[PDB]
Design a protein around this ligand. Structure first.
Ligand SMILES: COc1ccc(OC)c(Cc2nc3nc(F)nc(N)c3[nH]2)c1
Length: 208
């Protein structure tokens, strides 16, 4: 069964700003999500220092970038800490409320969209290039979940019956029709080199 939830009003507002504002420098979505992955990998790494059993669900700490032209998706995969149901439905939204407001304020004073990550809400930059985002995630303390949103003010959560992922998070970007450049190998490489060059975890760009 699929539960449908309303975004907090501020988040829905931010999402619509991201979708509606004319802003050509869309490529920053990728460093935002890679950075989110890196924080999540840092978290499970730190936690395992005092409980090595936390790595029973997978020892490898890394990031995969997987384009698929047939499906028109770009997937960012990590083996970080993963998200619980509570994170998905409640906690992320609660923390995002302040960041969103600060960001929206900054945006006059003349900040720009590329600065979204300094407000801890970089995830929503996915909406610069994706019409729909699906997030598959698994935390040690919980079951595997599928979060999904095409914006418009709501998101869904369901327990995921797909392939089990061990531990971590996959963000599946269903790209907008005019955003398929982000499926191209050389465009992805270029972006990773420019914005994510010093991430402390292996980043593997899959080819097709
Ligand atoms: C639905 O997913 C999100 C919604 C809002 C949001 O930041 C407001 C984030 C940001 C984020 N949180 C994450 N937690 C883990 F363990 N791994 C990741 N790769 C994560 N990315 C995710």
């Amino acid at each position: 069964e699929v539960e449908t939830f309303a975004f907090q009003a501020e988040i829905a507002q931010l999402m619509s700003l991201i979708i509606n504002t004319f802003y050509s420098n869309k490529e920053i979505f990728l460093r935002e999500l890679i950075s989110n992955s890196s924080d999540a990998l840092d978290k499970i790494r730190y936690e395992s220092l005092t409980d090595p059993s936390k790595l029973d669900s997978g020892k490898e700490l890394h990031i995969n970038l997987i384009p698929n032209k047939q499906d028109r998706t770009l997937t960012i995969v990590d083996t970080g800490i993963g998200m619980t149901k509570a994170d998905l439905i409640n906690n992320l939204g609660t923390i995002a409320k302040s960041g969103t407001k600060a960001f929206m304020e900054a945006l006059q004073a003349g900040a720009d969209i590329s600065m979204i990550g300094q407000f801890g809400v970089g995830f929503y930059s996915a909406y610069l290039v994706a019409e729909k985002v699906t997030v598959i995630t698994k935390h040690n303390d919980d079951e595997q979940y599928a979060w999904e949103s095409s914006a418009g003010g709501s998101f869904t959560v369901r327990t995921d019956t797909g392939e089990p992922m061990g531990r971590g998070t996959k963000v599946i970007l269903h790209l907008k029709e005019d955003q398929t450049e982000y499926l191209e190998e050389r465009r992805i490489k270029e972006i990773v080199k420019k914005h994510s060059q010093f991430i402390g975890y292996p980043i593997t760009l899959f080819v097709e």
